[PDB]
Amino acid sequence: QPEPDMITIFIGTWNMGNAPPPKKITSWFLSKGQGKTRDDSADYIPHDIYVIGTQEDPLSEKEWLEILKHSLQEITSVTFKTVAIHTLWNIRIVVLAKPEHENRISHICTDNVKTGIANTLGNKGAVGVSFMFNGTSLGFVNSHLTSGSEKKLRRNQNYMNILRFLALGDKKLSPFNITHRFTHLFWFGDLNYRVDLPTWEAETIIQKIKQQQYADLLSHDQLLTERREQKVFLHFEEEEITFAPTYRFERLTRDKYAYTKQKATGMKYNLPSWCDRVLWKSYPLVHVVCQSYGSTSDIMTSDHSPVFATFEAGVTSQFVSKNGPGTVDSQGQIEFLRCYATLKTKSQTKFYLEFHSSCLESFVKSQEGENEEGSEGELVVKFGETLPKLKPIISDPEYLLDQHILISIKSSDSDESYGEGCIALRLEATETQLPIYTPLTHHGELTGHFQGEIKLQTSQ
Template sequence: MHLRKKMEATGSSEGGDLISVLNYNNEDLEIHTDRTDRLSVKIVQMKDLKKQVKCVFLKLKVGGFSRRSNLIKNTGEQDGALKVNQDFSFEVIDPQSDVLSIQVYCKGVFGLVDCIGTCKELPVENILKHTDGDNKVLEAQWYDLYSKDGRKKRSGQILMHVIVGAKEVEQRMRAFVGTWNVGNSQPPLDLSAWLPTDARYEIVAIGTQESDYQPRAPFTECGKDWLETCKNNVGSQYRIVHYASRGQMRLVVFVRDDVEKAVSDVDNGSEATGVGHVIANKGGVCISFKFWDTGLCFVNSHFAAHDGQCEARNGNYREIVRELRVGFQSMDLLNQFHHVFWMGDLNYRLDFTKIQENPMTPERHFWHAQVKQILDGNFKQLLQYDELLREKSASRVLHGFMEGDIKFPPTFKMQKESSNLYCHKRMPAWCDRVLWRTLEGCDAKILTYTHCPTILTSDHKPVSATFALTTHSLPPSIFGNTTDDNTRWHIRFASLRASNLRASDVNGSSDPYILFTGRNLIQDFKSKVKHQTLNPEWNMHKDLPIIVLSTFSLQRLEKEYLMIQVLDYDYASANDSLGFTTIHLAPVVSAYTSGLCEPTLFKVEILHNGLPAGTLEGSMKLSWEKNSIRRKSGITRSIISRTQSLQESFKKRVPAK
């Protein structure tokens, strides 16, 4: 039974002031048991639009919920096709009445917007009638554009792929993450020694570096050759979630066809850290998406090479975290996805500077001594000199990431066409790594972490890690198609303070304030600015907003996070970021459902460019009450109305001259 119905049944008032408790026991708080379907739409491309249309965008709507695409530029390709490749997902609340509608708009002179066509409505019920089990996949097909009334055919077509499926409340899934520096050499067609071929994983993510080689016929582009090689190896049971590349870096993510319905909100991005931060010989590419309601992000990176460049590698990491934006654009990627997987040729070496005079060109006897350690399997001894373990331990790179135990030999620098011989030009090193990071309250377990010695075409060996994850499918954010906005969940802070923030101003201080953001809020909220301090403390009555949530279901809310950006106020220029963090809402929901009156304490770490940048701590409470935003606007309207009435009354009493 929904929460709103429970309130009506118990006589609870939605119009009263703060309702501190709902007088329900824990069993009553099971507020969502109905089946929920998810409809995912992938717009592949459009064609035959009017030639004068230079820039278009789409609006999609299902059951009262609408989504808008990014702008799509008409580049005037010969075949008249516009590549779109954008994904949209909707919660289907009422399959009997919900329909999918799509409209295409163009931007004209002076920014005017005009609807140039609409697809005929696609009833969700019609799709479900032909459902195979709980999953229905319509093959991508072309849909004609019509006038708004659907009577007149317009110029243009949309290639669209629709998936509808029932969400699973909780699912245990497995993911394969692989990385390989291809060495700009043509790889073998058979990669089964490295890549999975038995469809045991729901997700397969493959990242490569220096992946630029002479493509094999019939391909004329290396990227297409590599993508086809990956597809052939993982097998026909997998579908491509997305493929991204920049320079010689490539990343492709596959999903097994039986769980393709779980994927939504696909996004991708890239950042070049090469010369001038433009040349893409180094940097990172990433792909993010939701698996049901669990956010996943895969980053493939290639850091600065050579011994003695450890700080440059650390800088590459900081730049990628700072500049690469996917998903919720106002947040960094580390604080918005439940799981982030970071793979690549990170190029961290074994640092023997304390025991070797010239480690960049090692003496032959010293090189032989270390290789013997490798052949004897004394990896633990060698890992004492591993730069990545040292830098991570000191929180100078990949802070908060975890890595499996390294029980395989260094993967660089190998002699080509050899499974276990190293090149004397360089000291062997574990350059190729896979790490992961999870938000508080999330579950991820590494299953295997290994290398593949039998692929011989590169001076690097492929590396792979496999994981077991728990993913969740949550109730919709709202109940049915209701538009009632009178009552909401609120978060009130009883205390809030930050410590050891970054100094952003030239005087060694900052003017910090807090921005609360995220899709689970009805709008962004800001605290007051605290001037000239690195350890601000906000007054709960004067300085802090009341956070109004857009989520109704407690079952959903306890799995969500409050996204936070700490900013430095600057009167003359754009505000500088002091860092990002998240607060898990499960403890405050638990306190509410348990009837605890005391605010819930929290303390979280702030990250700036992926590294520690202070802490944020305090206490907060959850309440169910009138929407304070509407209440304030209602008061404002009331004051304006009364003022106007007084003015009219005054005019009537004072005769005109």
């Protein structure tokens, strides 16, 4: 049985509004309804991995797992295996995989983050799962962020607390948060961003939804506008939205949006909004293609409609040469030429680099760079040709060209990272000086840039 070089992944997010689901929820897993939907001819073809995020979930883990497994078995005639399940309050994540993947999946991690202090600690936060699929690391985050049209800044703060404090992936990657730990990271949930239009325009918004004219609404979607101004989800992707707002509906129909202020809403309006989202972030030059992104039309127990997204995701095999793992492959080397970091920091300490990658036996520390002043105020840390030669565990180009090098720039004084980024080894050529670039972030905010040249030697 050959190892796959591609898998498909289902992402579901549903805020269940504290109500049990209806007897049939198959439309969700079939990506049927509104938006970018899945072709009928694929209905019997199982996804490799299903990841289900719920919010306001009133079920026990046992009750929900039974409903999910029964639904997938009805669709596919496959009995899926439970990879992981984790619940914080009424926020839950389930990961199911085809039984043929049981031995391909390892290093399963789960964690949660509670957002807010005192008043604002008690029901919002995130749960997450990570694991290895052969040679590929996968991470999944389900978050229920702060509610209310006038709290987009709070939502952005919730986002930063979740990416800092969610402990998934390889703990040896100590300078790196979840936005750098995975080949593919999917972040979904009731993110609770709203269409920021005046309250008086509610009936106008409903009219536009009835006409399937979403352009004037999406131009006011707080997640799109905050992302465009680099306030949140920096370096994440989202498929184009072509489905109606998924909140806030009257239950038992989809014909009516319930937007007017009520005692039950804390006297807040809920203008129709795209609260329920799926975003992703993959390492550079890895195959990731969104194949569906939409909402169901026929599941009406909640004031939200379920959202689905599906992806093709590139995966690599667990590589074994005569040499690595457990030694170097003296034929392989990675060289950095003329490299420098441009940092936004006002501080003046010395900096060094750490290189982390699963193609190295352990991370590599550089010597300190030489600081200079950029022409527009910046700190430029020059490394020249002083960076160590990296010795990969395997030199075979079918392995090495698929790998990635994580870079952290650290203060000599404090050993704290000022910036993290990632460089693909999927080069246009080997034994050739080629430009490399990554932005640098810390706590998922832009802090600088790393650029220079690379020279990769493989056994070929």
